[PDB]
Every structure is written in C-alpha cells, then in structure tokens.
Nucleic acid binder design. Structure first.
Ligand code: CL
Ligand code: CL
Ligand code: MG
Ligand code: MG
Ligand code: MG
Ligand code: MG
Ligand code: MG
Ligand code: MG
Ligand code: MG
Ligand code: MG
Ligand code: MG
Ligand code: NA
Ligand code: NA
Ligand code: NA
Ligand code: NA
Ligand code: NA
Ligand code: NA
Lengths: 160, 95, 154, 186, 140
RNA sequence: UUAGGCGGCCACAGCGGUGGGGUUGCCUCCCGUACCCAUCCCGAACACGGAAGAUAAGCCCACCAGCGUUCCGGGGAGUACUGGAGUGCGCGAGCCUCUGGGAAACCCGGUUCGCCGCCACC
RNA sequence: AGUGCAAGAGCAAAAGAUAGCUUGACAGUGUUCUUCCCAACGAGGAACGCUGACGCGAAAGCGUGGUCUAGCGAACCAAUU
RNA sequence: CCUGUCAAACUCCAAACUUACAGACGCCGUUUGACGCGGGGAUUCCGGUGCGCGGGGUA
C-alpha cells in the first residue's frame, strides 16, 4: 500500500500496547551500524540526514532507506570500515486499515511508523574526513526512499 | 460519556497529587462557618464523607444554616438555585 | 486617553466583541469614542483591536473633531465654543479638549453624546485587512497616524 | 526523602506525639479538651481550646507547682495526679471554663490509671466531663493508700529523702482540703 | 560514657519450627515459662495450606530467666563469626536467638515519641563478640 | 522554652552528617514489681512505684548541602504552545504577520538542615 | 501489600492485619443532591438530619450495611405484617 | 556508567484558556419597570456551511 495512506500526522498518537494487540513486528534490522563498539566522539566528521517536513515514516520505509544507505557505505568502506551510522528514530505509532462499509470502521492493525518533526535528524553517521563524500552519497540514496525532502547537514567538520 | 454514574470523568479532580496523599489535617474538618459566609467548594480526595456531587467542585456558595454537623450551602448551577449538604472538610472561606 | 474608531462592520464579528464596542458606546461603522487609558479599558480595546483604529490624538486634532462632530446628549445643536461655554465646565472647545486628554472629565459629564459620528475617510483609509505595521488601518496608531485618520474623517 | 513523589508524615506524627485520628474525634465535641499528660517525675493537666493559629491553653496545672501549696511528697503518682487535675480544674473554673472532654494523648485507657485520676480531680473542681466512674481507681488508691501499704513491707524506707517513714495519704487529704477552700491563691 | 553504652541481653528467644506442638513441653521445662503457639501464613504444597494454625512454639526470655538459660545453652554450641548479625545479634542451634543492645533501647520500643536508634549507638558484631566472648567462652 | 506540654502550616520541616548540653531544676534514658493495670509467653510494651547512676541514645542548642524539597537570579526563551485578526505564503501537510498571554526539560549560581501560635518555666 | 468482583480513585498509631465483642444490614419520618448539568420527568441510588430503640468505647465518638462510583422494576392482582 | 527513542486510555511539571463568587469601570433598569414571578398561545425536536478543536475513515 502507498505511503499516501500513512505519511500524515493527524490521527491521535496510537502507541499504548497495553490496549493494542496484533501489532506486526518491525522490519528495521538494526539501528546502530558500522563499528558500534567505538564512540561517536572518536570521529572528526559528523553528518546527519535532517527531515524537512513533519511526517510519518512506515517501518518498511525506515528499513528500505537505512538499508540502501549502510549498504553503500559497506561497499565503499568495507564490511568493517572505520565509521558508525545511527538510525535514531523508532516506529512507535501503530497503523490501522479498515479492511461492512463505514460501519464498525475502526481499522485493524497493519503496521507501524515513526513520527518525525521537521528539522529533526533521522540518520547520523560519523566518519573520517576522507569518507565524508561516501556518507553524503549514502544519504543522497536514503532520502530517496522516504516521503520528505531532506538536508544532508554536516556538523563537526570544517574540513572543506 | 460511556456511563453516567456520579464519579464519571472525575479521575483528575477526585485524586491527590502524590505528596498530598494520606489523611488530612483535622483543623479544616472542624472549621465553623456562619450563615451568609461565602465558601469555596472543593472535594478533598482524602476525606470520604461530607462530599457533594463532583459537578459542583469549583462553585462558591453561601452558607445558609446546617444539618447535623454538615453545612447547607446555597449555589447556583447555571441558572438553577440548589442547596448543597457538605461538611467543612471540603470547604474553605472565600478571601 | 485614546480615540476609538470602528472601521469594520458587525456582520460575522464575535458577539462578545460586538458587545464590547457597544459598551464603549459605538454602534455603527465610523463612529468614534474617547476612552481613558485605564486597566479596565485597555482590556476592552485590546479585545476590539482587530475591528477598530485607536490612538492618542493631538490636542488640535481633537478640537477639530469635537467642533465638527460632537453633539449634545440630545438634538442637533452645534457644539462650538459658545455652546461649550453655555453648557460645560469650560470656556471653549480647547478647554474641553484639554480636559478630555488629561482625562479629568468625559463627554457625558458635560452633556455630550459619548460618540463622535465621523464621516468616511476622504482619500480612503489604508485597508481593513491589515494592521498598521503592515500598511493596514487596523489596530494601534501613532499620534500622527491617528490624526491623519481622524482628520480625514473630520 | 526519596523523591518528589515521597510522602512525609505531618511533623507531629513524625515525632510520634499526636494521634490525629483521635484528635479529630476529640475536637468534634466542640468542647475544650482536658489535656492530661505524664512525665517520669511529673504529671500535667491543661485545658485547651482551638485557635486560628494553634491550640490555646486557657488554664493548666503542673505537679511541680503543687508544692506551692504544701505538697512535700513526690510528684509522679496517683495522689499527685488527682491533685494536679483538681488545681487545673479550679483555675479552669476561674477562667470561665465549665465543660471539657478528656484527651489522654498517646496514653492507655487503663482502669485506675493516672490520666483518669487527673480527670477525677478536674471533675471535682466543678468541671463537666464525660466520664465513667468504674474506670476510675477506688478513692483510697487516689489518696495513695497503695503506696503506704507498700512501705509497710518496709525493711527499707520507700522514700529516700526524708518525707515520713510510713508515708502519709493524709497529706493528700490535707492538700485536697486546702484546694477545696475558697481562699487559696490560684 | 561507657556505662550507658556497654552491651546487655535484652531477650533470648527459643523456638522450634516444626510444621504442624507436642514439643511445647520441652521448651517450658528447658526455659522456665510458657511457650507460644506459632501460626503460619500463605498456603504451601507441603500439606501446609492452613493459614492460621499451630506449627511452632517460642519463648521470649528476659533478665535472669535469659541468663540462667544461657549459662547452659551457650555451652552446647560453638559460636562463630559469620553466625553474627549486622546489629550484633546471633542465633545458634531447636533455635536459640540472643538479642543484644545498649541501655536506652526503650527509646525505639516505647509508644510515645519513640524513635529508631542512631547507627552510632547501634551495636556491632565486633562489640558483640567482645561483650559475650568476655563471658565464659570463645569467639570464631 | 539551661532541655517542657498542646498545636497550626504539613519536606523551606525529608535523608545523611559534625560539634555541644544537664548534682537536689526540666525531659529522658535509668532503677524496681506490693499494689491499679499488663503480656494468646515474656513489668520488653502497657501500668504502677521510684531516684543509685548517666548525658552514651532520645531530646534541646549550634552547624554541614552530598541526596530530596521550596523559592530566586542568569541562560534555555519571549523558544514550545496559545485566545483575537488577515483577499499573507504554501499543491498540500502546514507556515507567516499583527495583537493579547506564555511554558517544560536542562545548565550555572544563590536559598532551604523549618517557620509561627497558646501555655507553663531561673 | 491488603481492602469480594471492571476501571479509575481513597486508605498506614488505617479504610489494611489479628483478636474480642456485637447485630445500625434497626423502626419511623424527613432535608438535599442525583437519576434528568444547564432545564421539566417516575422507579432506583446517595449524602445529610431528626424521633425511637440499641451496639461498642474511659470518652469524645463511631454504626442510616460492604472505602467510593454498577448489582435494578409501575399500575392492576395475589400472598404476607 | 555511557548511549538511542515514545504514550488517547503515563505524569516530577505545565500554559493559553474556560469557569464559581465578589469589587471596580463600562453598559443597562427604576414614566421605555430591568432582574424575577404567575398565566394564555405557539412554532419546533430531517438542518446545512465557513473557521477553530476535534474522533472515525486511503479518501
Ligand atoms: Cl450534592
Ligand atoms: Cl503523656
Ligand atoms: Mg482528563
Ligand atoms: Mg442625539
Ligand atoms: Mg473619492
Ligand atoms: Mg482598500
Ligand atoms: Mg552528647
Ligand atoms: Mg460507608
Ligand atoms: Mg399486567
Ligand atoms: Mg407474597
Ligand atoms: Mg474545556
Ligand atoms: Na454487516
Ligand atoms: Na523524499
Ligand atoms: Na491529604
Ligand atoms: Na491461637
Ligand atoms: Na543526651
Ligand atoms: Na426518587
């Protein structure tokens, strides 16, 4: 189903699992990638992917983009390159679908999504000044798999 | 409302902030008011008896005599005059 | 002491906003009233802020308007120096006006209608869809801003 | 103590000095409380009323200010208790106080105990206080008969300081006699 | 200072935690006063479902009654370190427990203005071993 | 208040900690069970009787801020949110301007180790 | 923690626990709120009195069933006091 | 210890705002009698739209 059915944040926050049952599991494989044993401060360059519009990103989307990003780094820096990227958001918002007409229309649980406020950083990578262009290219691919337009903002790094 | 009992929708107003928990000081449960005195009506979450219907929490009536130990306070619900049986424990002098 | 001029009609305005304008003695578009600068009054004009034009007028200006648009509590009688003198606690318009701005008295206490029914602004006004800081004619004005308006509605 | 949500008992409950559930039942009579308290060497009796900022003591008596009338004996026993209550009752009567309810604080309602004694004396001073005669000690034990008969099993004076040998419950009669007189300086 | 600080025996409780008694007879003779039935709480699979019901007995001794029991009880045991409480108490054995504390302990046992005893004024295993050890026997 | 009793507010009073204080005064601990009374067993407690001793507890006095709490400064912040108005912007979601209000977290620095009432009392 | 049962709420020298005693889960008649916000409407419910008779307690006092909000039924007719 | 996120049926916090009563100003009433009381007569109990806040629903 299209994200057009879920990308907006207008329904109430629906997260209380003590009242919701049958919630599908998340497809997000992992939130922390690269060398997770190392610290983010051990890196001179910090680049984040900032969402420009407030929206809801379905878990299949977070995974689809997270994957296509890290996969690029792995390919450019090796399965053990010196970097660490983080998907900081989690899909707490439960999604329904009314699948009778509008009678007893409260939908059934079909998925989950993360609510991101515009300006927030969805992804954050940490690398060495040399790999900065790869991490930028990884993000250029990641934002092509989520609803909003984004900014690839570089934080610690005045090595231009 | 899914039901229409008296304590419906009172979760907030009839509950105490954790710190005000426990038995209340006796001083105000024994206060004496004189006919004509304006008093504020607020149920004390810790005192079971002498209460009035929650809807009236917030009203400011006028004492007009008593009944037993409880006081009879006159109030105006919207445009309707009502007399409320309530003990001092749930009353404070206006001003 | 501020001069209040209603610039937007009643149709669609909140009832509680209309009721205020009424308590301030204004019941028609282009009607003006002189209000003291007190806490109670400030609350009122703040509430009317989007349908009115207010500000402190200069002594002269007030005079021009009192001459031109003031009226007795009843009747046509032109409120001029002579009228002022024979009916008020002052000698002439300037005297009355000074008392109004200094907030020592009101148009009622002197037997005058609380409302100055002005004339449409000659040359037009700056629009009733925007405030003064945006080129509109709504909201608070400069003493010079208010005067230009009052004078055009002379 | 632990966090913002932690509940701290009222000060006088922390100090384990006031039973508030009882204080409430007590204040309900709308009368003045006849506060009867004890000490190892002394016994106190106060007549308290409610006040805007705290209780008001209208009249009181302490076993120590008993000697001021002749009492040459110890001050932490039944005869001492009765008398201290009587004196307070008299001062109370003087102050314009007529009725009262017995507040024995954290003490136990044990029959014949000293608080009840404090209550009897106070009652005898002409003060109206809800009571129960058969919860009071028998006249003699009030006089101090039990102590004399204990000194009887002597072999060693029950009293160190020199105040009689076989003791004198009479001194009690003599002191009560004194208080009951209408010339005494209250 | 020392006097109102030197240890003393408050009570020696002797009990038998059977499970359903006929043993009360021995505790009475071994101590010098009546025992006390011991009910249990919660239901147990060990056919011990009955909430309130005889399961054990105990005797709380104070003063001489307590010493005169120790002048024979203690001997029948080999006191050790680990066997000591943090407050300076200890239990050996038929159970025999000995409660040790300093003078004004009534402060925390009375009704009026009661108060818990300041740790500084609380007893210690060391000070405990000492006190007792200094009375017809050896430590560890 | 050279140590007490009854309270009000009910943590600004809690938690933890340091120093000081009592020969016939006070409170205690303390000493002791013939009695009133008492322990489903224990004068432990409760109750009663009492001063040989003590200031080690408690308590009272002086003080410490590490934790908890109260209030204040500076910063976060006139940010977030928001009552009134708009032929302002935006495909839209939504945003902006004017007017009237206005946080929360957190950081840094102060404050807080109770205040007050009645009574009795070298 | 416990407090019979939803959920939310109340409670610590207790509203919980243990023990003991007791039948106020009493008769009669009301005031007030609720049912039905405002704003009329029955049964039902509750709060709070009084009269009478009682229980417990030293006493103040508490007991108009269960800590609070669900557990309820007209006229006609029958049986019953 | 450090590090990454949330809540219609969470809350150590906490608005704007709504709301009881009272005072003040304003406006109103005392020949236009308000506020209130008693009585006669209704109509009405298919509503719709914009804006703000919503709940459901891909819409
Ligand atoms: Cl009510
Ligand atoms: Cl006492
Ligand atoms: Mg709510
Ligand atoms: Mg006219
Ligand atoms: Mg023209
Ligand atoms: Mg125009
Ligand atoms: Mg010392
Ligand atoms: Mg009840
Ligand atoms: Mg039929
Ligand atoms: Mg029948
Ligand atoms: Mg509302
Ligand atoms: Na169907
Ligand atoms: Na995109
Ligand atoms: Na409370
Ligand atoms: Na038994
Ligand atoms: Na001391
Ligand atoms: Na009814």
């Amino acid at each position: 189903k299209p994200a057009s059915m879920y990308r907006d944040i207008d329904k109430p926050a629906y997260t209380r699992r003590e009242y919701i049952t049958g919630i599908p599991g998340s497809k997000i494989a992992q939130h922390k990638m690269g060398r997770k044993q190392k610290d983010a401060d051990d890196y001179p360059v910090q680049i984040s992917l900032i969402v420009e519009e407030t929206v809801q990103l379905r878990h299949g989307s977070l995974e689809a983009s997270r994957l296509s990003a890290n996969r690029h780094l792995i390919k450019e820096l090796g399965e053990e390159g010196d970097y660490k990227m983080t998907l900081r958001k989690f899909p707490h918002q439960v999604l329904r679908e009314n699948k009778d007409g509008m009678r007893a229309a409260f939908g059934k649980i079909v998925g989950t999504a993360a609510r991101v406020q515009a300006g927030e950083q969805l992804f954050t990578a940490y690398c060495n000044v040399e790999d900065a262009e790869h991490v930028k290219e990884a993000f250029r691919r990641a934002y092509n798999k989520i609803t909003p337009s984004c900014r690839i903002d570089s934080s610690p790094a005045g090595n231009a | 409302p899914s039901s229409n009992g008296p304590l419906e929708g009172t979760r907030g107003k009839l509950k105490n902030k954790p710190r005000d928990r426990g038995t209340s000081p006796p001083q105000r449960a024994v206060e004496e008011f004189d006919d004509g005195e304006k008093v504020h009506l607020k149920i004390d979450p810790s005192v079971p008896n002498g209460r009035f219907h929650p809807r009236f929490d917030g009203q400011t009536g006028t004492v007009e005599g008593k009944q037993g130990d409880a006081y009879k306070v006159d109030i105006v619900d919207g445009g309707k005059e009502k007399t409320i049986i309530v003990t001092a424990a749930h009353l404070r002098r206006q001003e | 002491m501020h001069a209040l001029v209603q610039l937007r009609g009643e149709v669609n305005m909140h009832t509680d906003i209309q009721d205020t304008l009424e308590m301030l003695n204004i019941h028609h578009v282009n009607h003006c009233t002189l209000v003291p600068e007190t806490d109670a009054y400030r609350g009122m004009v703040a509430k009317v802020n989007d349908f009115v034009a207010f500000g402190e007028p200069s002594q002269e200006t007030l005079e021009t308007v009192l001459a031109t648009r003031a009226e007795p509590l009843e009747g046509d009688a032109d409120v001029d120096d002579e009228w002022v003198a024979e009916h008020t606690d002052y000698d002439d318009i300037s005297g009355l006006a000074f008392a109004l701005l200094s907030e020592e008295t009101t148009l009622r206490e002197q037997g005058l209608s609380p409302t100055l029914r002005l004339h449409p602004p000659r040359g037009g006004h700056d629009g009733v869809k925007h405030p003064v800081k945006e080129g509109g004619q709504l909201g608070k004005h400069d003493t010079e801003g208010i005067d230009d308006l009052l004078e055009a509605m002379r | 103590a632990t966090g913002p949500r932690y509940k701290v008992p009222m000060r006088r409950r922390r100090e384990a000095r006031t039973d508030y559930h009882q204080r409430l039942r007590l204040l309900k009579s709308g009368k003045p409380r006849l506060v009867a308290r004890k000490s190892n060497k002394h016994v106190r009796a106060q007549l308290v009323t409610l006040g805007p900022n705290g209780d008001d003591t209208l009249a009181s008596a302490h076993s120590s200010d008993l000697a001021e009338y002749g009492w040459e004996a110890p001050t932490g026993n039944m005869p001492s208790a009765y008398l201290t209550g009587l004196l307070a009752g008299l001062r109370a009567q003087e102050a314009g106080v007529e009725e009262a309810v017995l507040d024995i604080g954290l003490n136990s309602p044990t029959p014949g105990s000293k608080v009840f004694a404090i209550q009897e004396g106070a009652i005898d001073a002409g003060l109206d206080i809800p009571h129960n005669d058969d919860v009071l000690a028998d006249w003699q034990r009030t006089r101090g008969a039990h102590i004399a008969e204990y000194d009887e099993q002597l072999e060693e004076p029950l009293y160190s300081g020199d105040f009689d040998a076989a003791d004198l419950p009479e001194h009690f009669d003599e002191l009560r006699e004194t208080l009951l007189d209408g010339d005494i300086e209250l | 200072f020392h006097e109102m600080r030197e240890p003393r025996i408050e009570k020696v409780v002797v009990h038998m935690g059977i499970g359903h008694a006929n043993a009360e007879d021995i505790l009475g003779e071994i101590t010098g006063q009546m025992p006390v039935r011991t009910k249990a709480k919660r239901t147990v699979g060990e056919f011990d479902i009955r909430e309130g019901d005889p399961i054990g007995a105990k005797v709380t001794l104070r003063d001489e009654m307590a010493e005169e029991f120790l002048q024979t009880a203690l001997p029948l045991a080999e006191l050790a370190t680990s066997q000591f409480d943090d407050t300076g108490n200890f239990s050996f054995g038929l159970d025999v427990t000995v409660n040790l504390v300093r003078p004004g302990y009534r402060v925390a046992k009375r009704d009026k203005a009661s108060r818990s005893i300041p740790t500084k004024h609380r007893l210690n295993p060391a000070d405990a071993v000492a006190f007792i050890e200094s009375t017809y026997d050896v430590e560890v």
